[PDB]
Amino acid sequence: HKSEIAHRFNDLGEKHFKGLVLVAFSQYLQQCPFEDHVKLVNEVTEFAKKCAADESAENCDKSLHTLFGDKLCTVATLRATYGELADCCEKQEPERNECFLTHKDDHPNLPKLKPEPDAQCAAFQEDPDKFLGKYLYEVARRHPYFYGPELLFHAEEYKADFTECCPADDKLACLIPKLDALKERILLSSAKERLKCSSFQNFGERAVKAWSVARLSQKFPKADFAEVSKIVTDLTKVHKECCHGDLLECADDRADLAKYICEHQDSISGKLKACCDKPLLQKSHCIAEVKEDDLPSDLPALAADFAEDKEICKHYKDAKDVFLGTFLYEYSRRHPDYSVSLLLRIAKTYEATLEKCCAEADPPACYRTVFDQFTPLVEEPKSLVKKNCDLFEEVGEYDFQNALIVRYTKKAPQVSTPTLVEIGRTLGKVGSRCCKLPESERLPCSENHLALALNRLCVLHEKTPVSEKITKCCTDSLAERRPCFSALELDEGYVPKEFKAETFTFHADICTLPEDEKQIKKQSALAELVKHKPKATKEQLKTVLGNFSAFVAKCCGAEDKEACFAEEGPKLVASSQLALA
């Protein structure tokens, strides 16, 4: 109470306290060296130990924001590396942290970590605390809004992988599959949390509560409304704190919520038992990623209370938010086969009916057939997910990505090529993950992951706005975000980008790139072909990229690579224009 840092240190323990502060500094200061950050963590850990022993000691009565924010401004390489970030230090709290958070880089362009099993299993023994410590540093700086306590968990997933594989003869065959899967889990985790932080920023905590009521109601249909409301309230406060960089307060409140859920597990979900017999980080993660519980047999029809009841306006008038919260809980728990956006869309439609009906002469007659408005809202995304999986299953991942790059480049040609390539590549991998699932699990998978990919586009677009359409879709409404983007079409009055030959000129440098980086260069060229020829068919673009593809493979196989590229390049560049007419 007297000393907050004393409280956090005592509650969290040294390793996790240090760990979260290393992650904290790594997110705020993303280009600072590892060894520099290690000292800053030690200097804070040092001071926290003094306060826990004697809370009356100087500076111990200050808030963690102040104490952390003060330590950030004493960084010697602050003005040199980060520039404008040093201007924030002149401002006072709470405006100083708000200033720091804006200067977090969502796209830091950092070296793509190669999994080198010979180098790392050896480095795991050379300096182990440096190893697991550096892993936290590297993930944190590439993902400045990554869920702090969730990153500590991934570091222990990292630890366990090396201790299991390094002993074995073939270190590569064991480690690579395990590490490859972890990179996929980290990108998804980063994406999930960024949408929580984005929702706070753009739509406030009411939007974050609504989303969570829907998701946890699906996860815990056995749980009553007062439990879901309690868990949502506590969990919203947790994500608010983490998203504002208060990782220590975030981590402590998260541990309290883990304890609560597990002390009341029988009346929340039968699927939590395994989770609650685990250490804090394993327990917390297991709760967050818990599979949905079996549906209760004893639930009545919704219409009885939400269409038929004659005192619905009375319920609505006195307690607007609570009664809508009640509707979302009841609709969500029955429909785990629905996306969270679809549930929030339905709930927004219900509110809209009551605002208009309780004003009219005969309200009961008005909101009698409110459930008829939902059937078309359900069918639209069902139709979209079918067409995309039908396309994916036919043409496979790479060609599905290319089809989506063309789709989104036409929707927004003003958006930077790297941004368009990223969402096309992301949404293609969603095809791989989601389409191989049963129909009931497929819609939520696709549309939930789509929301994460659209948020990424909105985050990158917010930093550097180019389109008013994209701004409107990104800022209007979170529930209506997917519909808004789905509706986007090629601007009739779009001025084609003028032809630059250098943009479509390849060299021998491409041959030495890893396959992923090789595809990005070709997929970057595809986006540019669309920007130059926006009225070209997807089938014309598929063919021209196939020629570029064949041209690269040929010259990268040639005895004289640079000689091949010099001769063949301009010929293909010239014919490609005529082909896209």
Ligand X SMILES: C[C@@H]1C[C@H]2[C@@H]3CCC4=CC(=O)C=C[C@]4(C)[C@@]3(F)[C@@H](O)C[C@]2(C)[C@@]1(O)C(=O)CO
Ligand Y SMILES: CCCCCCCCCCCCCC(=O)O
Which segments are annotated as binding site for Ca(2+)? 4, 11, 241, 246, 249, 252, 256
For ligand X, the closer CB: 85 or 223? 223
∠ CA 546-551-557, nearest 5°, is 125
Burial class (CB in 10 A: 0-12, 13-18, 19+), 398: middle
Would you give the distance in Å from CA 404 to the centre of its chain? 19
Tokens 């306006």 label which residue?
313
CA distance 357 to 521: 55
At closest approach, how far in Å is the CB of 349 from ligand X? 8
Secondary structure (H, E, C), 226-255: HHHHHHHHHHHHHHHHHHCCCHHHHHHHHH
Q: Which residue is nearest to ligand Y (CB)?
A: 211
Annotated binding site for Cu cation: 1
Q: How many CB atoms lie within 10 A of CB 526?
A: 24
Which of ligand Y, ligand X, none does 44 bind, CB closer than 5 to 8 A by kind? none
**Which residues make up the interface to ligand X (CB under 6 A)?**
206, 209-210, 213, 321, 324-325, 328, 344, 347-348, 351, 479
**Could you tell me where the DSSP H helices lie in 75-170?**
78-82, 85-88, 95-102, 117-126, 128-142, 148-165
CA distance 449 to 426: 9
At closest approach, how far in Å is the CB of 1 from ligand Y? 30
Provide the residue count of the chain.
Answer: 581
Q: 57 in helix, strand or coil?
A: coil
Which of ligand X, ligand Y, none does 213 bind, CB closer than 5 to 8 A by kind? ligand X
For ligand X, the closer CB: 119 or 322? 322
**Which residues make up the interface to ligand Y (CB under 6 A)?**
192, 195-196, 199, 207-208, 211, 340-341, 448, 451-452, 478
Which of ligand X, ligand Y, none does 321 bind, CB closer than 5 to 8 A by kind? ligand X
Which of ligand Y, ligand X, none does 452 bind, CB closer than 5 to 8 A by kind? ligand Y
For ligand Y, the closer CB: 12 or 191? 191
CA distance 407 to 424: 9
E strand intervals along 272-379: none
| Tokens linked to 126 | 């050379």
For ligand X, the closer CB: 179 or 195? 195
DSSP 508: G
At closest approach, how far in Å is the CB of 325 from ligand Y? 14
Q: Which residue is nearest to ligand X (CB)?
A: 210
Which of ligand Y, ligand X, none does 75 bind, CB closer than 5 to 8 A by kind? none
Tell me the chain's radius of gyration from C-alpha atoms: 26
Annotated binding site for Zn(2+): 65, 244, 246
At closest approach, how far in Å is the CB of 455 from ligand Y? 7
Burial class (CB in 10 A: 0-12, 13-18, 19+), 88: buried
Which of ligand Y, ligand X, none does 209 bind, CB closer than 5 to 8 A by kind? ligand X
For ligand X, the closer CB: 53 or 319? 319
- Contact predicate 555/568, CB 8 Å: yes
At closest approach, how far in Å is the CB of 454 from ligand Y? 8
Which of ligand X, ligand Y, none does 195 bind, CB closer than 5 to 8 A by kind? ligand Y
For ligand Y, the closer CB: 152 or 454? 454
For ligand X, the closer CB: 323 or 400? 323
